[PDB]
Amino acid sequence: EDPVTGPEEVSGQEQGSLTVQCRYTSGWKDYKKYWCQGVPQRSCKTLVETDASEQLVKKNRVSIRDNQRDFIFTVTMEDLRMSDAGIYWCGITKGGLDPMFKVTVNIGPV
């Protein structure tokens, strides 16, 4: 299958939170995983990235935890703002073109 896959879209509410599950194939177990934002795709802004271990990492309001048993890294976006809406990417860091999957984030008020 595809190196990395996730939901096509995910929704959340202001001040609430949302979680994204980025599924990857076994071979990418020991690669750093990341959550990227914006376009162009290959110029996206990295919001958080792991160190290739299962240790949870957090930067600002985003968290990332890689489960190397089920091969899925979970991204959590908290204290959601309407401005958080947009295009994001599940990604796996490697020399060259990284495996990436586009995830559209929708945010609703109140």
In sequence order, what DSSP letters do the residues of 73-88 get, joined into one string?
Answer: EEEEE-S--GGG-EEE
- Sign of the torsion formed by the C-alpha atoms of 40, 89, 96 and 43: positive
Backbone angles phi, psi at 84, to 5 degrees: -75, -15
Give CA–CA dist 42/30, Å, rounded.
22
- Domain residue spans in the chain? 1-110
Distance, CA of 70 to CA of 25 (rounded, Å): 9
What is the C-alpha separation between 31 and 19, in angstroms, rounded?
21
Superfamily of domain 1-110: Immunoglobulins (2.60.40.10)
d(CA 21, CA 73): 6
- Find the angle CA(12)-CA(10)-CA(66) to the nearest 5 degrees: 105
Report in angstroms the alpha-carbon separations of 8 from 50, 90, 97. Answer: 22, 11, 21
Question: Residue 90, Cα to own-chain centre: how many angstroms?
Answer: 4
Q: Do the bridges between strand 33-37 and strand 18-24 make them parallel or antiparallel, or are there none, so unpaired?
A: unpaired
Compute the distance between CA of residue 35 and CA of residue 101 in angstroms, rounded to an integer.
Answer: 10
Measured distance CA(62)–CA(19) in Å, rounded: 10
Of 6, 4, 18, the residue nearest 107 (C-alpha): 18
What DSSP state is assigned to residue 44?
P
Residue recorded with tokens 């979970």: 74
Resolution in A: 2.1
